[PDB]
Amino acid sequence: SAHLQWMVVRNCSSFLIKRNKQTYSTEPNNLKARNSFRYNGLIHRKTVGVEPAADGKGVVVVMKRRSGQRKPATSYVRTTINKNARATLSSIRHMIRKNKYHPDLRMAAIRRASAILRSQKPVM
Amino acid sequence: KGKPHCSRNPVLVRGIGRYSRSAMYSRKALYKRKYAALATVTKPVGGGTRVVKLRKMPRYYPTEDVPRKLLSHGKKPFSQHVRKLRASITPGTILIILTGRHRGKRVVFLKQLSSGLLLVTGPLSLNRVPLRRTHQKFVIATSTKIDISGVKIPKHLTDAYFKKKKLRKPRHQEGEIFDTEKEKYEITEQRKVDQKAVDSQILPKIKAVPQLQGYLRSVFALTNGVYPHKLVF
Amino acid sequence: GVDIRHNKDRKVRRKEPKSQDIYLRLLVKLYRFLARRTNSTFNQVVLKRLFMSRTNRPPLSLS
Amino acid sequence: NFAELKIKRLRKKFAQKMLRKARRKLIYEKAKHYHKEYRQMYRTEIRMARMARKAGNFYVPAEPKLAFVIRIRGINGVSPKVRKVLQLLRLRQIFNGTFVKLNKASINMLRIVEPYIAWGYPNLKSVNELIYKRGYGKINKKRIALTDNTLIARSLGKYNIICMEDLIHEIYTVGKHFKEANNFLWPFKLSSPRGGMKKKTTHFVEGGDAGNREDQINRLIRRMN
Amino acid sequence: RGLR
Amino acid sequence: AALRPLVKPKIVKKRTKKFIRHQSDRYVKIKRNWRKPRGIDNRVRRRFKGQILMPNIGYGSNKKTKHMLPSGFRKFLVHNVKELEVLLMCNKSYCAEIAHNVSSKNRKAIVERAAQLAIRVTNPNARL
Amino acid sequence: RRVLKKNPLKNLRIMLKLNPYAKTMRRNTILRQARNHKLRVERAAAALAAKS
RNA sequence: GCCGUCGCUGGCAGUCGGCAGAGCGAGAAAGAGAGUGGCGCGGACGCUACGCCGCGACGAGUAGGAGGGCCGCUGCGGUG
RNA sequence: GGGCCCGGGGGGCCACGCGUCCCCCGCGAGCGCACGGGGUCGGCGGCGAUGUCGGCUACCCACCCGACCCGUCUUGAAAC
Ligand SMILES: [Mg+2]
Ligand SMILES: [Mg+2]
Ligand SMILES: [Mg+2]
Ligand SMILES: [Mg+2]
Ligand SMILES: [Mg+2]
Ligand SMILES: [Mg+2]
Ligand SMILES: [Mg+2]
Ligand SMILES: [Mg+2]
Ligand SMILES: [Mg+2]
């Protein structure tokens, strides 16, 4: 279960990183990258990830479907959003709210899909 | 649609009224005053009509935001603060400057501006101190006053009129090419006409007091054996 | 200075179980929640006994 | 709907706004009667002496019920019999102060601890300054500053002490629930005597500081609180 | 009710 | 073009000097690192007047500004490019410090990434 | 969070937060005092005409 | 004001959101209970619960005891 | 003096409803101001690119106060 494998992963993971009085985590679908039950991207039954698109522009969103739970291959669905900075930040918002899909992660997902746009604009 | 009325009880002391609660009720005659019981906008387009939304969602969200702060009640902006003034300073009083370029120069106090700075002007022809602002703390109020009540000080001599104006001459391409240093403060013909007009009314009164003009032309300075706490000025 | 004695300032009760198993450290989470969020002095006793060592909670016999 | 639950919640928010006006009126008309009480107990102590000076006799005023005790020595070198009594008086620290009702068993303790305290009979203005400025309550075994009457009512309410005025009246006029009010009052922490002690190590009758200075405790309170 |  | 922090509070430190060891001046075998003096007749551990001082717990730093560099940022050792994405959601409160061993060919493609990510690096001109 | 302790003896509205009677206790002894000082200046200005 | 210890065997899983209604500080043992008859799709942070937060009181120490060290040294199984 | 200063015939009241029975003879809205659950200014001025700004720590130097050499046995050690 989620709380079980969190009580197993809280200290003896391989993504856990502990130096400089901080403790972050390098999980695939952990947004804010910090080691916590709430933001861990491997423990729960429904997670959310916001990665940068493989090319220059866009933001991919990785939801974890419910049906396939022990099948890692057909477990995650991915959607590339190569739109303006605002439509994508209303599409992630709809993807999360209107679906009622792990709704306490929404502002984290927006802040991350904004960090990506900002790290994909032309530098100065 | 009731006409506003001032407080019906004078303030004996700050925070305490002159009349009691029942007295206020009787004065207000409340015994006969019993009472009992946007974002979207349609706009045509070249098609159909579009429901344009005002103040759309921001296009950027910084990774972190500062949390809000608690609410205070007793803190107000400087513009709304109450400007104090020691009773030792009155219109026509002679003051001595201590910090400005007019160090130790005697001037004739004009009035107090809205901000709080004292608008003062010593005779320009005597001490060369025109209409200017000076803080009350940094000025010594000499115990020598002259009737200046009959002096129509122009109304446009506000704090904004006396506010500084950035030269805004760091550099430019035009200025780098045809450099003209960093400019100066060219005394406006308005500040000059105002200074002349004020002097035309102040000087006749000053000359009435014998030796007053010479005293103003003089400069206050400490000497051997003189201590500020031991002499009354 | 005050003339108190700190001999007994540190109460020695068990703040948590000494074991590290995670099927007990989850029961203790659920019962610490019930203990603080309910007004039943039952949950508080169950929690205080879930802390106790293996020698303070002995076995029961069926008889 | 929710139009019913709204007006219901507003009736609750109006009953909780009237149960407070009734309590502010009660506190007000209480303090208004304590002003009258104190005025009577003051004027009658002058009557009962003028009626004795008219006949020529003497009026012996009632021995006082309330004392205020202050600790004027350190914790370094105290006997055990004096260290047990300075801690049943809750004076575990120099310049601590407390109120004490007088009887045989109390005077016979202020005699054991006489060289370590400087006690006396507090004025009403002195109990006012003390309760208001240095007034802390022993709530839940926590020294919580008395900031509102709902901190006194919440604990001493069952004794009909519901405001700082009922507290002052219960302390000044030593009441039935004196033990409970004095034990609800965290012992006052006073600063050093401004001006300075006369002599800490000798009795007040010896031109010093210790002992009982019946009337003159207020002169020390004003320069210490 | 008194104030109605 | 400095990368400002989220908020820059006032940093106050109850002590700036190090805590030198007793008699680290008369000798060379006694280093400056601190060792609590445990001798009987010692004058430092009795807290005499005018002697060396001792690291009490009272000298602790304000928790609000503890470990916080004078640039209003906390810090993080970065061993490679991949360890930046861990820090990209802590941008305005933590900084990066490429390790001492990362060669300049990698440190260039690390400062480059942290530049895109707007993450502040304390040693961005390190090796070159 | 901890409530800062103001002084009920220097803070008028904390004195009214703790003792709503002190408002009238203080409006008195201010009216009464301005009227006793007006009675004194009346005596003392009838005596400058009683020794004149 | 700041650091820490102790105590409150304190509080927080309620982040209960167009399947919504945003509360449990207030002197007085207990329900913002049910039924039964007279446009604009929007709302910061949090929660490694071994975590976070709030309150007070306290802070010497040899011999000795205990705890906590993201203090340090060398090798082993894993893992970066 | 006390009894709501028992009862009859110029200033202050946290008193001011109508309808009785009777002994004593449950929601009025607004609008502001503030000694009101810990500081804000919607106030300002000066200088700033080869000589100036900041750097508490870290190098040297100056001065004032403090300041005996550590481990040890000892009732006691800076100890002749
Ligand atoms: Mg102490
Ligand atoms: Mg002694
Ligand atoms: Mg003095
Ligand atoms: Mg200690
Ligand atoms: Mg010396
Ligand atoms: Mg030895
Ligand atoms: Mg010997
Ligand atoms: Mg020795
Ligand atoms: Mg010798």
Swiss-Prot record, chain A:
GO CC field: cytoplasm; ribonucleoprotein complex; ribosome
Cross-link (Glycyl lysine isopeptide (Lys-Gly) (interchain with G-Cter in SUMO2)): K57, K64
Modified sites of kind N-acetylserine: S1
A GO molecular function held by the record: structural constituent of ribosome
Chief location bin: cytoplasm
Known role: Component of the large ribosomal subunit. The ribosome is a large ribonucleoprotein complex responsible for the synthesis of proteins in the cell.
Quaternary data: Component of the large ribosomal subunit.
Protein name: Large ribosomal subunit protein eL28
Species name: Oryctolagus cuniculus
From Swiss-Prot, chain E:
Function text: Component of the large ribosomal subunit. The ribosome is a large ribonucleoprotein complex responsible for the synthesis of proteins in the cell.
Subunit structure of this chain's protein: Component of the large ribosomal subunit.
The name this protein goes by in its record: Large ribosomal subunit protein eL29
Lineage top rank: taxon: Eukaryota
Compartments it resides in: Cytoplasm
Similarity field: Belongs to the eukaryotic ribosomal protein eL29 family.
Taxonomic placement: Eukaryota, Metazoa, Chordata, Craniata, Vertebrata
Swiss-Prot record, chain F:
GO terms, molecular function: structural constituent of ribosome
GO annotations of cellular component type: cytosolic large ribosomal subunit
GO annotation, biological process: translation
Cross-link (Glycyl lysine isopeptide (Lys-Gly) (interchain with G-Cter in SUMO2)): K8
Main subcellular localisation: cytoplasm
Domain of life: Eukaryota
Modified residues (Phosphoserine): S61
Pfam families: Ribosomal_L32e (PF01655)
Alphabetized UniProt keyword annotations: Cytoplasm, Isopeptide bond, Phosphoprotein, Ribonucleoprotein, Ribosomal protein, Ubl conjugation
Classification via PROSITE patterns: RIBOSOMAL_L32E (PS00580)
Record's subcellular location: Cytoplasm
Residues the record lists as N6-succinyllysine modifications: K49
Summary of the function given for this chain in its UniProt record: Component of the large ribosomal subunit. The ribosome is a large ribonucleoprotein complex responsible for the synthesis of proteins in the cell.
Family to which the UniProt record says this protein belongs: Belongs to the eukaryotic ribosomal protein eL32 family.
Quaternary organization: Component of the large ribosomal subunit.
Protein name from the UniProt record: Large ribosomal subunit protein eL32
Native organism: Oryctolagus cuniculus
Organism placement in taxonomy: Eukaryota, Metazoa, Chordata, Craniata, Vertebrata
From Swiss-Prot, chain G:
Modified residues (Phosphoserine): S52
Cross-link (Glycyl lysine isopeptide (Lys-Gly) (interchain with G-Cter in SUMO2)): K17
Annotated localization: Cytoplasm
Sites of N6-acetyllysine modification: K23, K51
Domain of life, per lineage: Eukaryota
Reported modifications of this chain: Citrullinated by PADI4.
Cross-link Glycyl lysine isopeptide (Lys-Gly) (interchain with G-Cter in SUMO1), where in sequence: K51
Intrachain disulfide bonds: none
Function: Component of the large ribosomal subunit. The ribosome is a large ribonucleoprotein complex responsible for the synthesis of proteins in the cell.
Known partners and oligomeric status: Component of the large ribosomal subunit. May bind IPO9 with low affinity. Interacts with RBM3.
Family, per entry: Belongs to the universal ribosomal protein uL4 family.
Name of protein: Large ribosomal subunit protein uL4
Organism listed in the record: Oryctolagus cuniculus
Lineage: Eukaryota, Metazoa, Chordata, Craniata, Vertebrata
Span covered, complete protein: 311 to 362 of 413
